[PDB]
Structure formats: structure tokens, C-alpha cells
Design an enzyme around this catalytic site. Sequence first.
Site, short mmCIF file in Angstrom:
data_model
loop_
_atom_site.label_atom_id
_atom_site.label_comp_id
_atom_site.label_asym_id
_atom_site.label_seq_id
_atom_site.Cartn_x
_atom_site.Cartn_y
_atom_site.Cartn_z
N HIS A 276 -26.30 -39.66 -18.75
CA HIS A 276 -27.50 -38.86 -18.64
C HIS A 276 -27.09 -37.41 -18.58
O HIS A 276 -25.89 -37.09 -18.54
CB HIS A 276 -28.28 -39.22 -17.37
CG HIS A 276 -27.45 -39.06 -16.11
ND1 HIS A 276 -26.78 -40.12 -15.66
CD2 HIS A 276 -27.14 -37.99 -15.23
CE1 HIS A 276 -26.07 -39.80 -14.54
NE2 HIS A 276 -26.29 -38.49 -14.27
N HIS B 62 -36.66 -38.63 -13.90
CA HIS B 62 -35.65 -37.73 -13.32
C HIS B 62 -34.82 -37.09 -14.42
O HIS B 62 -34.47 -35.90 -14.34
CB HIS B 62 -34.76 -38.52 -12.37
CG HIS B 62 -35.53 -39.12 -11.22
ND1 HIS B 62 -36.21 -38.30 -10.43
CD2 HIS B 62 -35.82 -40.43 -10.78
CE1 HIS B 62 -36.93 -39.00 -9.50
NE2 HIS B 62 -36.69 -40.32 -9.72
N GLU C 185 -24.47 -29.08 -12.73
CA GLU C 185 -24.47 -29.28 -11.29
C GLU C 185 -23.21 -28.69 -10.69
O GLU C 185 -23.23 -28.04 -9.64
CB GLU C 185 -24.56 -30.76 -11.00
CG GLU C 185 -25.65 -31.43 -11.76
CD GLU C 185 -26.16 -32.64 -11.04
OE1 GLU C 185 -25.48 -33.69 -11.07
OE2 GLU C 185 -27.23 -32.53 -10.43
N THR D 184 -25.19 -37.21 -7.37
CA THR D 184 -25.86 -35.94 -7.17
C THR D 184 -27.37 -36.09 -6.96
O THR D 184 -28.08 -35.10 -6.82
CB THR D 184 -25.59 -35.00 -8.34
OG1 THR D 184 -26.00 -35.64 -9.55
CG2 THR D 184 -24.10 -34.67 -8.42
N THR D 185 -27.86 -37.33 -7.02
CA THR D 185 -29.27 -37.61 -6.79
C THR D 185 -29.33 -38.76 -5.79
O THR D 185 -28.32 -39.45 -5.57
CB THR D 185 -30.02 -38.09 -8.08
OG1 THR D 185 -29.64 -39.43 -8.38
CG2 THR D 185 -29.74 -37.19 -9.26
N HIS E 112 -28.28 -33.24 -17.07
CA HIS E 112 -28.94 -32.40 -16.08
C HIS E 112 -28.96 -31.10 -16.85
O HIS E 112 -27.94 -30.73 -17.44
CB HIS E 112 -28.10 -32.24 -14.82
CG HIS E 112 -27.81 -33.55 -14.15
ND1 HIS E 112 -28.56 -33.94 -13.12
CD2 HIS E 112 -26.83 -34.56 -14.34
CE1 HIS E 112 -28.11 -35.13 -12.64
NE2 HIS E 112 -27.04 -35.51 -13.39
N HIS F 162 -23.09 -36.63 -17.73
CA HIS F 162 -22.42 -37.53 -16.81
C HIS F 162 -22.32 -38.90 -17.41
O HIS F 162 -23.33 -39.52 -17.71
CB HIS F 162 -23.17 -37.62 -15.49
CG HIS F 162 -23.15 -36.34 -14.72
ND1 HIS F 162 -24.01 -36.19 -13.72
CD2 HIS F 162 -22.42 -35.15 -14.78
CE1 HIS F 162 -23.87 -34.98 -13.13
NE2 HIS F 162 -22.89 -34.33 -13.79
C1 LIG Z 1 -27.31 -48.07 -5.40
O1 LIG Z 1 -27.14 -46.86 -6.17
C2 LIG Z 1 -27.71 -46.84 -7.34
C3 LIG Z 1 -28.45 -47.92 -7.85
C4 LIG Z 1 -29.04 -47.81 -9.10
C5 LIG Z 1 -28.89 -46.63 -9.82
C6 LIG Z 1 -28.16 -45.58 -9.27
N1 LIG Z 1 -28.08 -44.41 -9.92
C7 LIG Z 1 -29.23 -43.53 -9.84
C8 LIG Z 1 -28.76 -42.22 -9.23
C9 LIG Z 1 -27.56 -41.61 -9.95
C10 LIG Z 1 -27.07 -40.32 -9.99
C11 LIG Z 1 -25.90 -40.23 -10.73
S1 LIG Z 1 -25.02 -38.77 -11.00
N2 LIG Z 1 -25.82 -37.57 -11.30
O2 LIG Z 1 -24.38 -38.53 -9.76
O3 LIG Z 1 -24.21 -39.10 -12.09
S2 LIG Z 1 -25.36 -41.71 -11.40
C12 LIG Z 1 -26.71 -42.45 -10.70
S3 LIG Z 1 -27.02 -44.12 -10.96
O4 LIG Z 1 -25.82 -45.00 -10.95
O5 LIG Z 1 -27.49 -44.20 -12.38
C13 LIG Z 1 -27.55 -45.65 -8.04
ZN LIG Z 2 -25.92 -36.96 -13.09
#
Ligand SMILES: COc1cccc(N2CCc3cc(S(N)(=O)=O)sc3S2(=O)=O)c1
Ligand SMILES: [Zn+2]
Length: 257
Positions: free
Chosen positions: A91, A61, A103, A195-196, A93, A116
Amino acid sequence: HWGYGKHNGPEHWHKDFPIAKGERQSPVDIDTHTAKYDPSLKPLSVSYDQATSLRILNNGHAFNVEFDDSQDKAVLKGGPLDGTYRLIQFHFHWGSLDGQGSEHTVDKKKYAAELHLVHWNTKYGDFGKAVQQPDGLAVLGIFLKVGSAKPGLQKVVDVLDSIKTKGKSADFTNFDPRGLLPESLDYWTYPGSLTTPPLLECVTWIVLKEPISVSSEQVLKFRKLNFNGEGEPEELMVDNWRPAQPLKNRQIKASFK
Ligand SMILES: COc1cccc(N2CCc3cc(S(N)(=O)=O)sc3S2(=O)=O)c1
Ligand SMILES: [Zn+2]
Ligand SMILES: [Hg+2]
């Protein structure tokens, strides 16, 4: 599985994750004119002097740098937050072109990429519990604009060769995340979501006013990553960003005028 393609992109997410149509979804467009300056907003406190980076990995991703969040080594306090939030990973985007990639937008303006830094509320014990709470996470969003090279970002850029395809990882220790912060910590804040997928609404978004600049070749290296794993047909990792969601019953507060 979910992705950013025509067949599994953002417009398909709701089918598997209904919360995609929720009340506090991110990202959103930051309309500078209707944003409310708030004087009771405390200044931000980013303490990343003891940050311990572990590894960097391509998860199909985006690429993520993970940190040791076993102790309060890199925390975020202040601002609209009440409690200490630990840095777990960061990470990006980015887009296939310089005029897209972020985003969050500012007055509908898109940036080349968006960093982020993800933090979780320590009062919840672990990340898993934090993601079950309305104030479980705090993500520091930083915009990237094309311009002069960002020295602190080059270390990440160099290692991208070793993690070209999904599933690859490499040790990435002793990386100082302070090298990615802009000069000013002025920000905008509002309650949103990831956002994902799973698109959980546990995030207090703190989006910095001041973007950092990176060279075209630095962001260029980002685009040479692969969504696919080794051995599968190559599919370049670009445009891994979600379109702005309606603000709804929400107000964006500014810490500045
Ligand atoms: C239970 O939910 C979970 C469990 C494990 C992983 C994740 N994540 C993956 C998605 C995602 C998207 C993020 S963004 N773009 O909004 O910063 S942060 C994030 S995460 O914490 O690394 C979430
Ligand atoms: Zn992000
Ligand atoms: Hg939540």
C-alpha cells in the site's frame, strides 16, 4: 473509528491503542549522520518472480494490492532478517502536496509518498500468528519522489477509477511488483511498529536508501481516491501518513557507508 482527520487522527490513537506511546513505534526520522554502518549486515534478497497479485481495494485508509501468500511466491530474505518473509500486500501513504506523504523521513526530509511492501515471518504459520511476535513482520519501505513517470506503477494508477470509495475492490492479477523496486537495494534498518492501528510492534523496518520517481500525474491520481464509502459525503484520501515517533532506545543501522 481511527483515521487521519482532526477528530480521529494520529494524536487520538493512544486512547484506543495505548501501544501508540510504546518503545518501538514507527515511523522515525532517519538521521543519516548518527546511523551506524554495519558490516555484518547481509545483502537483501527480494524474490518476486513468482508473485501472484489478486486484487486491489480501497479500505478507507489507503488502497491495497493483495497477493497470494499461500506459498513462498514472493519472499524477502537476507538483510537483518533471519527467516523467510512472505509478501501479503503493499500500500501507499501520500500527501495532499508533493513535499509530504512519506511516513519515514531522512534528515527530517519528507517524500511525496511511501510504498510499504508488507511481509510476514513464515516460521509463524499465518499472518495472524506473526503479528503476535516481535519479529513477525518485515516491511520494505520505499520512498517516492516526483519526477519522471514510473512505468510499473501505471497499471495501479489506471485501475484507481474502479476503487474510488471505501469498500470497492477490483481484480488486479498478473501485476509484477519488481516494477516498483529502485536500482540499488541499499538500506537502513531498525525495529519498529505498524504505522496505523493496531500499531503492533512486530516490524523489522527495512527502508531503502534509493527512492523511485513517479510523475506528478501518477501521484495526482492517488489523491482522487475517497476515504468515504459510496453515497456518503466525499472526503478525499490524502495525507494518510503518521508523524515521526521518537527513536528512544534504538539504533538505526545502515548497510552502506
Ligand atoms: C493484527 O494486525 C493486523 C491485522 C490485519 C491487518 C493489519 N494491517 C493493517 C494495519 C497496517 C499498517 C501497516 S504499515 N503502514 O505499517 O505498513 S501494514 C498493516 S496490515 O498488516 O495490513 C494488521
Ligand atoms: Zn504503511
Ligand atoms: Hg508484535
